[PDB]
């Protein structure tokens, strides 16, 4: 609401995802997406900083190995 977004590309795909996300991580992704606009000398979300920030923060530990359902 304060950060300038003003885009057609909405964050609806990154809502119903698995791997439950704490409330502090929403702040970290939107900061990391903000760094990925400023570092490359932009001002606006170009529909790729949000996805690269998500793929950076989630890589900790993963699959249930299709075992015990």
Partner 1 sequence: DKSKLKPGTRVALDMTTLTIMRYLPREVDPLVYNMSHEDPGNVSYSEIGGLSEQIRELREVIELPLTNPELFQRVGIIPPKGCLLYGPPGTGKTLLARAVA
Partner 2 sequence: KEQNGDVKEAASILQELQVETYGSMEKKERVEFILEQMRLCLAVKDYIRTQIISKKINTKFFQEENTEKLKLKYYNLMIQLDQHEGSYLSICKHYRAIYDTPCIQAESEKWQQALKSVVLYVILAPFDNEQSDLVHRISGDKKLEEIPKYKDLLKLFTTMELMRWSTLVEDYGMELRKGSLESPATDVFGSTEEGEKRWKDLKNRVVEHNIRIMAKYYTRITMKRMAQLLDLSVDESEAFLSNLVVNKTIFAKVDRLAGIINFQRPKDPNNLLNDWSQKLNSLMSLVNKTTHLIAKEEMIHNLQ
Footprint of partner 1 on this chain (CB under 8 A)? Answer: 2-4, 27, 30-31, 34-35, 37-39, 43
Given the complex with partner 1, which of 42 and 65 has the nearer CB atom?
A: 42
The string of DSSP codes covering the chain is --S----S--TTTTTS-SS---HHHHHHHHHHHHHHHHTTT--S--SSHHHHHHHHHSTT----TT---
Given the complex with partner 1, which of 31 and 57 has the nearer CB atom?
A: 31
The entry of partner 1, partner 2, none near residue 40 (CB within 5 to 8 angstroms by kind) is partner 2
């Amino acid at each position: 609401s304060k950060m300038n977004l003003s885009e057609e590309v909405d964050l609806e795909d990154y809502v119903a995802r698995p791997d439950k996300i704490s409330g502090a991580d929403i702040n970290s992704i939107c900061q990391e997406s903000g760094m990925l606009a400023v570092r490359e000398n932009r001002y606006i979300v170009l529909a790729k900083d949000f996805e690269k920030a998500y793929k950076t923060v989630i890589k900790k530990d993963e699959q249930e190995h299709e075992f015990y359902k």
